[PDB]
């Protein structure tokens, strides 16, 4: 006469499928290929139009010159 409840795993599976359907639908770009309100935020925050290249170039040249100086000091004539 014991009854077996559906259980928490039922709601995770059913809820996860339902949530996946809902989240996928609201995240679509819409009828036109126009980014949504949230799409523009993620594109804006991770912009780095030239930041990595600028910093990387400055560091590469500096360690280039530093190697130059050590080569000069290490190969100096006795």
């Amino acid at each position: 006469n014991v009854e077996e409840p559906l259980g928490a795993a039922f709601y995770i599976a059913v809820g996860g499928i339902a949530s996946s359907f809902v989240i996928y639908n609201i995240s679509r770009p819409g009828p036109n290929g126009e980014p949504s309100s949230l799409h523009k935020w993620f594109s804006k925050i991770s912009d780095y139009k030239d930041e990595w290249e600028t910093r990387n170039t400055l560091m590469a040249a500096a360690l280039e010159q530093a190697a130059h100086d050590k080569h000069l000091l290490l190969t100096a004539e006795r």
Partner: protein, 494 residues
């Protein structure tokens, strides 16, 4: 402050809190383990944030910080696609490894947590440093904590295991260091964006390859240089084993993508047949000995050797799919070996106190939840499709075949033999009769803790086995940069 420095700083903060909170509150050890776990969660949250901002098709290192204060040894941090997934693997594995030892560490709990937190910082720094000598410094830094971790928390043979892993790794690494120092002398630095533009002459490349290869074959490990792993991965505490097989084996693989492919292309291509003979021999020999291994944790440890042979052959394939498959297999091995070590070193071992296969049989009858996850993990170890293990094995094996067909054909035999030892070990433990008559007490099934570390690991392998694009899409552009060769009508355009 860079997000990459935050990644290295959070675990040090947790170490500080663990070591000082006795002065603000006998504090319960639950509080200590709560601090360490939340520390790993925040480190994982930061790595997820980095990945959301990360760009998949940039050949500039991302999230770097300008120094402008040059010294003799400065830590420069940067990330690209060939390192971003190893950072994610380290930050996902570390919380699971902490929960897997929540109850089994009974003495010296503060020391255990501080070592694991320090291991997190050091292993992460290996993936993020932008200098070749910085790579050696972080690669070798993990040895003293690993020596102490094994010796304070290991099983009966912990002393011999601790010595083996320390002396093997040191010996191999000393040959890598001599290779790195030669590079540093010719070029003037080991910063990546400078050394990768250098062109070493062919004979220099050959002797540079030897010395870097000796170290990476000790760390892969290749068969015959692998007794340190068969000791250390078994005698280690469970959290140590997960870290040692999920992240520490991956160091030699990520090391190939920084230290051999861009700067030793001619030596790598000319020596691939030596690499492939060793990798082929390792695939067969390790497979046959895994079939005859009677320690359950040693059997899972030996299968790591066979899988690492395939990613090593994929990394020397000089093809896009072989290189991406190598990274895919490395990652898939991290989830699967973590789960199989939890099943053996954490579920069987805690319940029985023994690791001998002769005492186990028919566990499915009383432990259905364990047998369900254990079986799925054993299919992952056999590279069954729908796991990320099939995707990595297939792509790695295809690249090895296309580079050198006889080596790929022998390496392909792993599809037969990995199934053999995985299915044999599963059948003897979960199936193979009624419940073993050596068990006096009955056994409880998985606790909620055991269930949710296995479920989480099994979730990652299956989700990525169905949509491996979640890693490949961020791999394609950067991994193009390590391929060596030309097409006749595609090259030298004008």
């Amino acid at each position: 402050m860079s997000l990459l420095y935050v990644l290295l700083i959070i675990p040090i903060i947790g170490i500080f809190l663990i070591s000082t909170i006795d002065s603000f509150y006998f504090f319960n050890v639950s509080y200590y383990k709560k601090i360490a776990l939340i520390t790993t969660i925040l480190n994982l949250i930061v790595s997820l944030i980095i990945y959301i901002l990360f760009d998949f098709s940039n050949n500039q290192f991302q999230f770097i910080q300008e120094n402008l204060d040059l010294s003799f040894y400065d830590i420069y941090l940067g990330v690209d696609g060939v390192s971003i997934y190893f950072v994610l693997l380290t930050t996902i594995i570390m919380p699971i490894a902490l929960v897997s030892n929540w109850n089994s560490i009974t003495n010296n709990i503060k020391s255990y947590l501080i070592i694991m937190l320090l291991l997190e910082t050091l292993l992460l720094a290996v993936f993020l440093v932008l200098d070749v000598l910085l790579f050696y410094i972080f690669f070798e830094s993990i040895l003293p904590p690993l020596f102490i971790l094994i010796g304070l928390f290991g099983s009966s043979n912990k002393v011999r295991a601790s010595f083996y892993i320390f002396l093997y790794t040191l010996l191999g690494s000393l040959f890598l260091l001599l290779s790195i120092l030669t590079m540093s002398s010719i070029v003037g630095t080991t910063y990546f964006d400078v050394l990768l533009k250098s062109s070493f002459e062919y004979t220099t490349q050959l002797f540079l390859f030897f010395g870097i290869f000796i170290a990476f074959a000790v760390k892969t490990p290749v068969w015959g240089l692998n007794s340190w792993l068969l000791r250390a991965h078994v005698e280690s505490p469970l959290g140590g084993s997960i870290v040692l097989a999920a992240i520490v084996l991956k160091l030699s693989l990520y090391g190939v993508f920084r230290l051999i492919l861009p700067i030793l292309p001619q030596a790598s291509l000319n020596l691939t047949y030596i690499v492939y003979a060793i990798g082929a021999i390792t695939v067969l020999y390790a497979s046959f000995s895994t079939l005859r291994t009677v320690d359950v944790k040693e059997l899972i440890a030996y299968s790591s050797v066979a899988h690492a042979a395939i990613y090593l052959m994929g990394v020397f394939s000089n093809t896009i799919q072989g290189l991406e498959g190598a990274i895919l297999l490395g990652l898939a091995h991290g989830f699967v070996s973590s789960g199989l070590f939890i099943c053996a070193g954490g579920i069987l071992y805690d319940r029985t106190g023994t690791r001998l296969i002769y005492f186990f049989r028919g566990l499915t009858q009383i432990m259905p939840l364990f047998s369900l996850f254990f079986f799925i993990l054993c299919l992952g170890n056999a590279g069954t499709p729908l796991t990320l293990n099939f995707v990595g094995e297939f792509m790695s094996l295809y690249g090895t075949l296309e580079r050198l067909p006889i080596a790929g054909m022998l390496a392909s035999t792993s599809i037969i033999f990995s199934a053999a030892y995985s299915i044999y070990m599963y059948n003897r433990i979960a199936f193979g009769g009624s419940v073993s008559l050596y068990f006096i007490d009955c056994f409880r099934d998985l606790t909620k803790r055991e269930f949710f570390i296995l479920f989480t690991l099994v979730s990652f392998t299956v989700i990525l086995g169905i949509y491996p694009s979640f890693v490949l899409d961020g791999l394609h552009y950067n991994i193009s940069s390590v391929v060596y060769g030309i097409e006749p009508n595609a090259s030298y355009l004008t």
